[PDB]
Amino acid sequence: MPFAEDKTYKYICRNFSNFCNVKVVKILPYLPCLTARDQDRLRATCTLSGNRDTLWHLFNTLQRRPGWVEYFIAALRGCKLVDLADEVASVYQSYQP
Amino acid sequence: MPFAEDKTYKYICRNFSNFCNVKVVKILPYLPCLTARDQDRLRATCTLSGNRDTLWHLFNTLQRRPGWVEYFIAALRGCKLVDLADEVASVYQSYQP
Amino acid sequence: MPFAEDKTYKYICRNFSNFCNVKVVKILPYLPCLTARDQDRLRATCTLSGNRDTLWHLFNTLQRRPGWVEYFIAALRGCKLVDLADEVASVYQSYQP
Amino acid sequence: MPFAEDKTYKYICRNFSNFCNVKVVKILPYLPCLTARDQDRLRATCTLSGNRDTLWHLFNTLQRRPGWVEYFIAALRGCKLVDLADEVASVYQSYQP
Amino acid sequence: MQIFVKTLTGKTITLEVEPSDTIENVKAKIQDKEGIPPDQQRLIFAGKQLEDGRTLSDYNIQKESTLHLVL
Amino acid sequence: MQIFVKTLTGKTITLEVEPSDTIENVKAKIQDKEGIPPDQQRLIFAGKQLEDGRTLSDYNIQKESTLHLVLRL
Amino acid sequence: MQIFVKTLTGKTITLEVEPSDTIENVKAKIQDKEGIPPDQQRLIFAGKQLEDGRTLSDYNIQKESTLHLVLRL
Amino acid sequence: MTTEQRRSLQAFQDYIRKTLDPTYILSYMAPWFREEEVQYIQAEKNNKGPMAAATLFLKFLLELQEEGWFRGFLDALDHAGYSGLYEAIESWDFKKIEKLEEYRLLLKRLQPEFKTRIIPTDIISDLSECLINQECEEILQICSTKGMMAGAEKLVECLLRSDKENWPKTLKLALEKERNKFSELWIV
Amino acid sequence: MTTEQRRSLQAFQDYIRKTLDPTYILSYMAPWFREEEVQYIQAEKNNKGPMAAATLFLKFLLELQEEGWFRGFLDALDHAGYSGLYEAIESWDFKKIEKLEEYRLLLKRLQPEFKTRIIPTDIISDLSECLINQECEEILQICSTKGMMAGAEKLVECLLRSDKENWPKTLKLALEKERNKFSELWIV
Amino acid sequence: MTTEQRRSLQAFQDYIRKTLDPTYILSYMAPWFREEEVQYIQAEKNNKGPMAAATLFLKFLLELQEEGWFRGFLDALDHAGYSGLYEAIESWDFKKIEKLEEYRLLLKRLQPEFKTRIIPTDIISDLSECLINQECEEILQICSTKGMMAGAEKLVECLLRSDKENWPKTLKLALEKERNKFSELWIVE
Amino acid sequence: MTTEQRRSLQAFQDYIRKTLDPTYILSYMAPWFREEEVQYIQAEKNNKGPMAAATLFLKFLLELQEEGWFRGFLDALDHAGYSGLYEAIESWDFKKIEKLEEYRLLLKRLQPEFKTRIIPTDIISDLSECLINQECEEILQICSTKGMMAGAEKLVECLLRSDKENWPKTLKLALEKERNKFSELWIVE
Amino acid sequence: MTTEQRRSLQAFQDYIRKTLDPTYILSYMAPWFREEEVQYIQAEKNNKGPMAAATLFLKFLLELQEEGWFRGFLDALDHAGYSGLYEAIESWDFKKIEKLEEYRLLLKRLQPEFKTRIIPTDIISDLSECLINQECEEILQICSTKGMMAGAEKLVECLLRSDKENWPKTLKLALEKERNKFSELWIV
Amino acid sequence: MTTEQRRSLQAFQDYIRKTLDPTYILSYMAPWFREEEVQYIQAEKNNKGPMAAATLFLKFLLELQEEGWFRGFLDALDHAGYSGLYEAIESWDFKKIEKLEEYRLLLKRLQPEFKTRIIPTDIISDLSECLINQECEEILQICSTKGMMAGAEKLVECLLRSDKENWPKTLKLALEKERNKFSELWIVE
Amino acid sequence: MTTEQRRSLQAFQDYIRKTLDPTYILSYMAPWFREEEVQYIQAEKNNKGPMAAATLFLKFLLELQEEGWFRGFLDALDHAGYSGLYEAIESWDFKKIEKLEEYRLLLKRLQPEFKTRIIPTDIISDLSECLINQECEEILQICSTKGMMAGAEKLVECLLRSDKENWPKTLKLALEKERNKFSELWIVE
C-alpha cells in the first residue's frame, strides 16, 4: 500500500523533532528492508556525524525502500519507543480509506 | 551449497530479535573461523559500544567467511543456546537438496 | 556584550596551544549552552578523531551559541582549569567597554 | 639523514606484511618523536577500529616526523624480539652517505 | 647531458652535468656561471632540498630536468 | 585490401596488406616505403597500441582503416 | 639596446644593436649568429619590409622591438 | 623542436586519459602551469571526475611553452608514483599498460562480488605499490566517512587506472592472506 | 566510395545525434581533427550540451576531406563503447536501436519518479555495461557533490543516449537486485 | 488561441525568473520540449546559474505550439512543489509572492551573519516544506563536502527562490526552537 | 566621482585577481549587483575555480554605474576578512602584498613536500588568522573526507590567496611548534 | 620590465577598449598570436562588436608569455594608424586623447542629426586621416548597399573610436567644404 | 519605482519585437546605453536580423536604472518615426497595432506575387510616411544594386514592421494610382 | 507521416545545398516557418552567401513538426522555378541533376575565360530559362553598375546553382548564335 507511505515520510519531516530520541545504531538491525549497502552507508555516517544528525538520513533512505512503514513501526517497538511507535502507526493508517 | 550460507545470513537479518540473547564476548572462542583481525575488531567494538550493538557486526563479519554457518551452529550450541542453534540448523539445511 | 565575546573566540584561536588540556567529554556537562545536537555531534567527532582534534570543533561550536564566553569561563572553572579560566575572563572583560 | 628516511618508509610499504605484529598500544610509549597531538589521534583509531587497522596510520604518521626511523628501530627492540628492528635497521643504514 | 637551473625570479640557466656528479659539483658549476658562492645556494627538486652529500643519480635527476635555486 | 598509415609529420602513406598479415608485417611494409626501422615504430589503431606478435584480423582492423605512427624520438 | 629577430621556424634569437646601426648591419649580425647569408634575408617590422640602405632609427625601431625573418626558400 | 613530443603525446592521449588523475600530479606541475587553469583542472575533476580532468590537464600540457617542460611532466609522473606510465611515455611503448586490459575487464566484471564480500581495509595495506600513495589515503577516508562498500567501489576505480605492470598479481597475493570467498574469482 | 557513405551517414544522422556525445569519442579520433575543431566541439558540449556537440561534430566529419575518415569514425565508435551504434551503422540496419525508442519515451515520462526513488550509487555498477564508462565517472561525481537526486537525474540522461540493445532489460535486473520501489513502474 | 495566456505569462516574467529553477521542473516537462532545448537549459544553469536558465526556459516555453502545454507547465509547477507559483499563475494574482520581497531583501542583507551563526543541519528538518525536495539534499551534500558555512550559503540562495507564502515566518519559528544568535536579527512582524 | 580611481583599480587588477575569492564578498555586494550577475560569478567559481570568478567579478565591478559602489566594495572586502587587501587598496600601496610574492613563489616550488609532510589539523589553529574563516571549514572538511594529503593541497591554494602580510612568518612559527619535517625547508629571515 | 608595463597597460585599458578594433591590428601582430586566439578575437567582433573584441584582445595580450610582446603591440599600433594612442601609451600621457572626450559626447547626442544631414561619400576623402584606412572601405561599402543614412551612421561609430587629436577640427573643415546644413551644430 | 512601467513594457514584448528595428532608434538612445551594448545590438541585427536584435534591445532596455529612460525610449520612438508604437505605449492600448495583424498576414501570403508585379520605385514615393526614412533609401539602394525584385522583397519586410495604423489602406490607394496586376489581390475592406 | 522520407531528404542534402537559394523559396514557406527563422536564413545569405543560407534553411526544414510541411516545401520549390530539383525530389531520382556535375566542374575550370569572353546581356535571353527569374535581374543589374566582367562572374555563380538538366546544352546553343571566342571551349557531345 505504497501511496500512504509517502504521506508518512512527509509527516516524519513536518514533525521530525518528535523522533529525536530514536537511536540509529540500535534500530538498524531491526530494519531488514534496508539493503547491505544501506546498512554500510548509514553506520558509517553515524560514525563521523553522530546519531541525531544521522537520523534525517536514516529516514530518507528508508522511505525509498518498499514497505518501510510496516517495518518501521516494529522497529520503533523493538527499541521500546512504544509511545512514538503508536504515534507512527496511527498516522500511517490515517491515509488509507 | 555456499549460496545457502548467504541465504542463511539473510534470515538472521530478517529475524534479528531471535538472536538478541547471543553474547559476543562469550561466543568468540567458539569461532576459530574468525581471524585475529576479525576477533580484535569485534572485541574492540564490543568493548566500546557494548554487547547488543556489536552483534550485528559479529554476524556481518561471519557471513564473509566461507563455511561459517557450520561453525556458527556449533559455536551457538557451544554457548548452550541450542534452542537457537536448531533454528539455524533447519534453515541452513533448507537451501540445499 | 555579544561583540566582545566573538572577539574572544579570535583569542582562543591565536592561542589554541593553551587549551590543549581541555578534555571535551569532561567539559561538555559543564556547557549546557551546547545543545542536544551540539553535544552529540562533538562526542562523535571525539570518538573518531580523538580529543585534541575535536577541541577545535568544540570552540567553533561554542562561538555560535549566545553568551558562551560566560558559560565557558564557568565551565573551565568546573574542570579545575582555573588558571586558564582566569585568562579567558581577563581577555573577555578586556574587549568589552 | 632525511633522504634515507624517505626511502625507509617506502621500504615499509613494499614489505608491509612483515610488520603486522607490532601492537600499537605497546609500541607507542617507545616513540617520543610522535606528537602529543599525534598519539591522541592514534589511540582513538586503535580504540574504535582495532589494532591492525591502526597500523597503516601509525607508520603513515611516523614518516611525517623528522628522525622517526632511528626511534622506530629502538621501539621494535623494546616492543619485540627485535628481528624487524634489524630489518629496517639494515635498510636505513644502506642509504647513509 | 644537460639540466636547467631556474631561479625563483624566473631566470633559467643551462648547466652541463652527468648523473655521477654530486650536488657539491652541481653547486660548483652553479658558481662558474652566475658567480654565486655555493654555501649561500640551496637547490630544490620535486620539493626536496638536495643534500650536498648525494648525487644527481640518487634523486633521479635526468636529461633536461629542472632544479630550483634559492638563497 | 588497403590500409592508411598516418605519421605525426602529417603525411599519410597508404600500404597494401591483407587481413592475414601480422603487425610485424605492416611495420616491414612501412620500412619498405618510408625507410624507417621497425624497432622505432609504434603503431596505434583507434588509440590501442598494436602488439608485434598479433595480426590485423585480430584487432578488427579493416579496409581503409587508419594506423597512427609514432617514432622513437 | 636590444632587438629580437624571430624566424618562421618559430625560434627567436636576440641580437645586440644600437639605433645608429643600419639594416645591412642587422642582417650581418644575424649572419654571425645563425650563419645565414644576408642575400637570403628579408626583414619585416610590423609588416613593413626593411630596405638594406636605411637604419633602425629611421624605421622607428626600438628597444625590444621585433623583426620577422623570411628566407629565400 | 618540442613538437616531436606534443604530436607523439596526443597520439597516445587515450591511455593518458585512462590512467592519470591530474590532481595527484598537480603539486609538481605548479611551477609550469599558470595558477588559473590549475584551478580549472581541479575544478573539472571536482565536477566531471578524474578522466574529464585528465582530458583537460592534457589540453593545457600541450600548450606549455618554456624549456624543460616535457621532462618536467615526466619528473612529476615518476615522483608522484605514476612510474610505469612514466616508463611508457619515455620509451613511447605502452605494451605493459595495454597488457593489463585483460585484468581491468575482469575486475569491472566481478565488481559487485568484490565490494560485497571483501573489505578494503583488509587488503589496502598490501596494495601500496599498485596505488598512488594518495589514493590510499583518499580510500581509507571514503571507507570511514561514506562507508566501506563505497570505499571498495573507489578502490576498484583506482586499480583500473593503475599502471603498475604487475598489480593483478599483487592483488591476488593480497587477498590470498585471509580466508576470502572472493579469492577464487580472481585468477591469473 | 567516399560520397556514397556520406549520404548513408547523413541519413541516419538522427540516431547519431541522439546517441553520441563526441567528447568521449574524440580521443580515438586523434589523427583526423585539428585542435581548432576539437576545442570548438568541446565548447559546444559545455555550452549547449551533448546533442548540440554531436550535431557540430557531424558537420566537421562530413567536412573532413582526408582519406579513411568514415572508417576512422566507425573504428572510434567501437573502441569508445558506442558499439551497437557501430553495429548498426556498419550494417546500415538501425532496427536494433529503434526498438529502444519505446523505452526511451517511457523513461522520459517516468523520469520524475526515477529521480526520487533511485539511489544511483546502488545500481551504477550493475548497469555499467549500458553506459560509456566515462559517463559513470560524471554521475558518481554529481552524486558526491549534489546529492542522490541530482545524480539520479544524470543517470537518466545517459541511459537515454545508451545504444545498447539490452539496457532496459539490464536496468530491470539491476533494479530487482536492490528492492527499489521504482521497479514496478518499469515493465519489459 | 493559446496566445491569450502566453502574453499574460510574459507580464509576470520577473516573478517566474526569480522564484524558479527549471531543473526541478524539467523532468515533468520532458514530453513537451525538444530534446536539445532541455540540454540547453541544463547548461545555462550549469554555466550562468539558475536564474539565467529560468530566463531561457521561458523563451522556449512561449515557443510551444501544441496545446495542453500551459496546463502541463502548471502541472509541472505543482508536482515539483513550486506550488504557490502555481497558485499565482492559475489565479493571475502574485500578491502573495510579492509580499515576500520584503523578506527576500532582508535575508540578503543578513546573509553574512546567517552563514556564521547558522548550522543548517539543525533547521533543515523544519524548512523541508519551504524548499524543493532536491534542494534539501543538494544542501546537505554541500555541508559534508564544503563544510557548514558553504552549506548555509546555499540554504540562503534556495530560500530566496522559495515561493511558499509563509517561509519567513516558518524560518523564525524554526529558529525559535534552539537558541540562535541569528534569531534576534530576523524579525517577521 | 567614480572615474579617476577606477583607473587605479584596473592597474592593480592582478592583485585582486590573485587574492580575492568573490564568494565571500558577494553576500555584502548584493545592493550594487544585478541578481543574475552574482549567480554568474558564482557559477564561474564552481566551473573554473576562484580566480576565474574573481576575474569575472572584477569585470562587473568596473561596469558599476550607481555611485557609492567603490566604498561598498571596500566595505565588503573589510568585513570578509580581506583586510590587508583592503588596507592596500585604501592607501593604493600594494608594497605589503607584493613582498608576499617571493614566499608565495617558494611554496609553489616546494608544494610537493608540503603535501606529504604537513598535517593540516595541527597547524590550522595557528594559521586561522591568515585564512578566510570559511576557508578553514572547507579545509578541515576535505581532511575528513579526502584525507590529510588532499587537505594540505587545499591549505596551499588558500595560503596563496592570503593577503596577510606576515603569513609566511606565521606559518614558520606554526611549523616550529609541532614540527613536520617540512619545517626545515621553510625559511623567512 | 615585463610586469611594470602590464600594469601601466592595464591602467589605461579603458582608452584602448574605446579606441581600438583589434581586427585591423592583428595583421601587424602576426608573430605573437596563435591562429586559435585570433579566430577567437575575430569572432567576438563579428558577434558582440569591436569593443568586445578589443576587450578580449587585451586578455590574450596580457596572457602572452613571450618576449617583446609590449613592444610588439605598440609597434603594431603605430603602423596600423592608431598613432596618438601609440603616442599616448608610450609616453603614459593620455591628456591628448582625453580632450577628445568632450566632442565624442557631443557627436553622440547629435548623432541623429548627423545620420540624416551627412552624405558620407562627400566627406570621407577629407577626413580619411582621422580614420583607420580600412574603416573607410567598410563605410563606402555600407553606403553602396544600404544607402547614405546607414553609411553615415557607421561613419559616426568610427569617428568616436578615432584617436587623432585633430579629428573634430578636421571634420569641421570637411563639413565646411561641402555646405552640409549639419556644420553649425558642430562647434570647435 | 521605474519597475511599474518596466513590467508593463514586458507584457507587450511581442508587439515591440515585431514592429521594431532598434537600429533606427539607437541614434537617439546613445546617451542611456553603455557603448558596448549598442554594438552588440548592431551585430545581432547584422547576424540574426532585426527582430532578434529588437529582442536583445529589450533585454538591455529593462536593465536601465537611472531615470528619464522610459521617456527617452518613448522620445526616441517618436523622433525615429515609430510614432504609433509610441502612441501605443504611452496609452497602453495596442488595439491599433493589433488590427494591423490581419493585413500583416495577408501581405505575407501575397509576397511572391508582390515581388513579381510591383516596381517599388513607383510606389515608394507614396508610402514615404508608412516606412522609416532610412528604410526608404535602404530599399532604393537594393533596387539599383540587386534589381527590382530584390527591392520589392525588402519593401515587404519593412511594410510588415510598419506600425502606422492605416498603411494597408495607404498601400491600396498607392496602388490605385497606376494599373497594377497586384491591386486586385490586395483588398482593404 | 514525416519521418520515413525526412531521412531521404537528408541523404540528398548535398544537392539541395548546391542548387537552392532559400531566398526565392521563403516567400512561399511563410506558413511553416517561425518569422525569426526566415530572417536568420535571410541574414546568413547576406553575410555568408546563398549556400550558407541554404544549409541553414535545410537545418530548420528538418526540424519542422506540423504536418503538411513536406508538400509545402515541394510546392514552393515548384513555384519558384526550381522545377527539376522538384522533379528530382518528387521521384527521389537525382540522376538528372547529377549528370550536370561534369559540366558544372568544367565551367569552374574554364571560369576565367568565361569572365573575359562572355558578354552576358547577349546570351541572357537564351539562358533565361536556366536561371531563376530574379537571378536575371540581379545579373543585368550588376552589368550596368560593375561592368561586363563582374556580370559574367555572376552569371557563372547562377549557372552553377541551376538545376535545369539541359542548360549546358542550352548555353552551347546560345554561344553558337552570337559567338564569343569562349564558344569553342564549351563542348557537350
* Distance between J108 CA and the closest CA of chain K, angstroms: 7
Residues I93 and I130 in one domain: no
Q: Which residues of N touch M18 (CB under 8 A)?
A: 35
- How many whole angstroms separate alpha carbon H25 and alpha carbon M163? 65
Cβ within 8 Å of residue N176, ≥6 positions away = N183
Task: Classify residue L145 as exposed, middle or buried by CB count within 10 Å of its CB (0-12, 13-18, 19+).
Answer: middle
- For cell 570518538, the residue is C47
The range of the structural domain enclosing residue J85 comes to 1-97
Residue I90 · residue I74 · CB < 8 Å: yes
- How many whole angstroms separate alpha carbon J28 and alpha carbon J33? 10
Cβ within 8 Å of residue K178, ≥6 positions away = D35, D37, K122, K123
* Distance between F52 CA and the closest CA of chain I, angstroms: 20
* Distance between C79 CA and the closest CA of chain K, angstroms: 23
Q: Which helix (H) or strand (E) holds A7?
A: helix A2-14
Residues 50-109 of N with CB under 8 A from J: 63, 65-66
Length of chain N: 189
Helices and strands in chain D: count of H runs, count of E runs: 6, 0
Cβ within 8 Å of residue L125, ≥6 positions away = none
Please list the helix, strand and coil fractions of chain M in percent, rounded to the nearest 5, in that order: 70, 0, 30
* Radius of gyration of chain F measured on its C-alpha atoms: 11
- How many whole angstroms separate alpha carbon F60 and alpha carbon N27? 52
* Distance between K49 CA and the closest CA of chain M, angstroms: 27
Cβ within 8 Å of residue B41, ≥6 positions away = B57, B61, D49, D50, D53
- How many whole angstroms separate alpha carbon I59 and alpha carbon I52? 11
Residue L77 · residue L83 · CB < 8 Å: yes
Nearest residue to K138 (alpha-carbon basis) of K124, K118, K117 = K124
- 3-class DSSP string for J31-85: CCCCHHHHHHHHHHHHHHCHHHHHHHHHHHHHCCCCCCHHHHHHHHHHHHHHCCH
- How many whole angstroms separate alpha carbon L121 and alpha carbon N43? 26
Looking at M52, M75, M97, the residue that finishes a domain is M97
Q: Which residues of D touch B45 (CB under 8 A)?
A: 48, 50
Looking at H97, H116, H131, the residue that finishes a domain is H97
- Find how far residue H123's CA is from the centre of its chain: 18
* Radius of gyration of chain I measured on its C-alpha atoms: 17
* Distance between M84 CA and the closest CA of chain J, angstroms: 20
Task: Classify residue J80 as exposed, middle or buried by CB count within 10 Å of its CB (0-12, 13-18, 19+).
Answer: buried
Supply φ then ψ for residue H72, to 5 degrees: -60, -35
DSSP assignments along chain L, one per residue:
-HHHHHHHHHHTHHHHHHH--HHHHTTTTTTT--HHHHHHHHHHHHHH-HHHHHHHHHHHHHH--STTHHHHHHHHHHHHT-TTTHHHHHHT--HHHHHTHHHHHHHHHTHHHHHHH--HHHHHHHHGGGS-HHHHHHHHHHHHHH-HHHHHHHHHHHHHT---TTHHHHHHHHHHHTT-S-SSS---
CA atoms within 13 A on the CB side of F64: 11
Please state at what angle helix A36-48 crosses helix C36-48, rounded to 10 degrees. 100
**Neighbours, chain L (3 or more CB pairs < 8 A):** G, H, I, K, M
CA atoms within 13 A on the CB side of D55: 21
Residue among A25, A39, A78 whose CB faces B53 most closely: A25
Output the domain CATH number for residue I153: 1.10.533.10
Query: Amino acid identity of H170?
Result: T
Residues L76 and L128 in one domain: no
- How many whole angstroms separate alpha carbon E44 and alpha carbon K81? 34
Which CATH fold would you assign to the domain D1-97? Answer: Death Domain, Fas (1.10.533)
CA atoms within 13 A on the CB side of G58: 11
* Distance between B15 CA and the closest CA of chain A, angstroms: 8
Looking at J50, J81, J97, the residue that finishes a domain is J97
Q: Which residues of L touch I35 (CB under 8 A)?
A: 36
Determination technique used: X-ray
Residues H115 and H80 in one domain: no
Nearest residue to A75 (alpha-carbon basis) of A14, A12, A17, A13 = A12
Residues M66 and M118 in one domain: no
Residues L67 and L159 in one domain: no
Strand partners, G44: G49, G68
Chain E contact residues (CB < 8 Å to D): 48, 51, 53-54, 58
C-alpha cell at B11: 534470515
Q: Which helix (H) or strand (E) holds E12?
A: strand E12-16
- How many whole angstroms separate alpha carbon M65 and alpha carbon J131? 32
Answer whether E47 touches K (CB < 8 Å). Answer: yes
- For cell 502566453, the residue is J6
Please list the helix, strand and coil fractions of chain J in percent, rounded to the nearest 5, in that order: 70, 0, 30
CA atoms within 13 A on the CB side of I51: 17
C-alpha cell at M143: 533596387
Q: Which residues of I touch A66 (CB under 8 A)?
A: 179-181
* Radius of gyration of chain E measured on its C-alpha atoms: 11
Residues H58 and H70 in one domain: yes
- How many whole angstroms separate alpha carbon L147 and alpha carbon L145? 6
Cβ within 8 Å of residue H131, ≥6 positions away = H124, H139, H158, H159, H162
- How many whole angstroms separate alpha carbon H108 and alpha carbon I19? 23
Residues J146 and J64 in one domain: no
Residues K88 and K116 in one domain: no
Q: Do I27 and H17 count as a contact with CB atoms less than 8 A apart? A: yes
Answer whether M40 touches L (CB < 8 Å). Answer: yes
Cβ within 8 Å of residue K119, ≥6 positions away = D61, D64, K148, K152, K180
Q: Which residues of K touch C56 (CB under 8 A)?
A: 121, 124-125, 140
Question: Which residue from J minimizes the CA distance to I105?
Answer: J31
Each residue of I87-117: b (16+ CB within 10 Å) or e? bbbeeeebebbeebeebbeebbebbbebbbb
Answer whether C56 touches K (CB < 8 Å). Answer: yes
* Distance between E5 CA and the closest CA of chain K, angstroms: 13
Cα-Cα end-to-end distance for chain F = 31
* Distance between I119 CA and the closest CA of chain H, angstroms: 13
Q: Which residues of J touch I159 (CB under 8 A)?
A: none
Peptide bond into L100 cis (omega under 30): no
C-alpha cell at D94: 644502506
- How many whole angstroms separate alpha carbon E16 and alpha carbon I45? 48
Q: Which helix (H) or strand (E) holds D87?
A: helix D83-94
Contacts 24+ apart (CB under 8 A), K133-138: K133/J116, K133/J149, K133/K81, K134/J115, K134/J147, K134/J149, K134/J150, K134/K23, K134/K24, K137/J146, K137/J147, K137/J148, K137/J149, K137/J150, K138/J146, K138/J147, K138/J150
Answer whether C51 touches D (CB < 8 Å). Answer: yes
Query: Amino acid identity of E3?
Result: I
3-class DSSP state of B32? coil
Supply φ then ψ for residue G36, to 5 degrees: -130, 140
Residue among M23, M42, M79 whose CB faces L49 most closely: M42
Contacts 24+ apart (CB under 8 A), H25-28: H25/H57, H25/H76, H25/H77, H25/H80, H25/H82, H26/H57, H26/K153, H27/E47, H27/H80, H27/K111, H27/K112, H27/K114, H27/K115, H27/K153, H27/K156, H28/E46, H28/E47, H28/H72, H28/H75, H28/H76, H28/H79, H28/H80, H28/K111, H28/K112
Query: Amino acid identity of L66?
Result: E
3-class DSSP state of E49? strand
Neighbours of J120 (CB within 10 A): 24
Assess whether chains D and C touch, using the rule of 3 or more C-beta pairs within 8 angstroms. Answer: yes
Residue B46 · residue B25 · CB < 8 Å: yes
Answer whether C32 touches J (CB < 8 Å). Answer: no
Q: Do A13 and J128 count as a contact with CB atoms less than 8 A apart? A: yes
Please state, in angstroms and as integers, the Cα–Cα distance from residue K84 to each residue in H134, K11, K167, following that order: 35, 18, 12
* Distance between B26 CA and the closest CA of chain D, angstroms: 19
Please state at what angle helix I101-117 crosses helix I148-160, rounded to 10 degrees. 180
Assess whether chains E and B touch, using the rule of 3 or more C-beta pairs within 8 angstroms. Answer: no
Residues L38 and L53 in one domain: yes
Residues M56 and M121 in one domain: no
Neighbours of D83 (CB within 10 A): 10
Determine the longest span between alpha carbons in chain J, in angstroms: 56
Residue among K121, K128, K140 whose CB faces C13 most closely: K128
C-alpha cell at L142: 555600407
Domain ranges of chain A: 1-97
Residue among C37, C42, C44 whose CB faces A47 most closely: C44
**Which residue, among E1, E44, E45, E60, would best test binding to H if mutated, counting the most H CBs under 10 Å from its CB?**
E60
C-alpha cell at N103: 559540366
CA atoms within 13 A on the CB side of N71: 4
Residue M89 · residue M81 · CB < 8 Å: no
Q: Which residues of C touch A51 (CB under 8 A)?
A: 40, 44
Q: Do A65 and I117 count as a contact with CB atoms less than 8 A apart? A: no
Q: Do F48 and I79 count as a contact with CB atoms less than 8 A apart? A: yes
Length of chain B: 97
Query: Amino acid identity of I186?
Result: W
Residues H49 and H30 in one domain: yes
Please list the helix, strand and coil fractions of chain F in percent, rounded to the nearest 5, in that order: 15, 35, 50
- Find how far residue K48's CA is from the centre of its chain: 16
Query: Amino acid identity of F73?
Result: L
Each residue of J85-117: b (16+ CB within 10 Å) or e? bbbbbeeeebebbeebeebbeebbebbbebbbb
**Which DSSP letter does residue M107 get?**
H
Length of chain J: 189
C-alpha cell at J154: 546555499
Nearest residue to C35 (alpha-carbon basis) of A81, J185, A52, J112 = A52
Residues K89 and K112 in one domain: no
Please state, in angstroms and as integers, the Cα–Cα distance from residue I8 to each residue in I5, N3, N8, N63, following that order: 5, 16, 9, 19
Residue M85 · residue M97 · CB < 8 Å: yes
Please state at what angle helix N69-77 crosses helix N3-11, rounded to 10 degrees. 40
Q: Do C48 and D43 count as a contact with CB atoms less than 8 A apart? A: no
* Distance between A11 CA and the closest CA of chain C, angstroms: 21
Q: Do I150 and J134 count as a contact with CB atoms less than 8 A apart? A: yes
Cβ within 8 Å of residue L93, ≥6 positions away = none
3-class DSSP state of G48? strand
Question: Which residue from M minimizes the CA distance to N136?
Answer: M147
How many domains does chain K fold into? 2
Answer whether A49 touches C (CB < 8 Å). Answer: yes
CA atoms within 13 A on the CB side of K93: 5
Q: Do K112 and E49 count as a contact with CB atoms less than 8 A apart? A: no
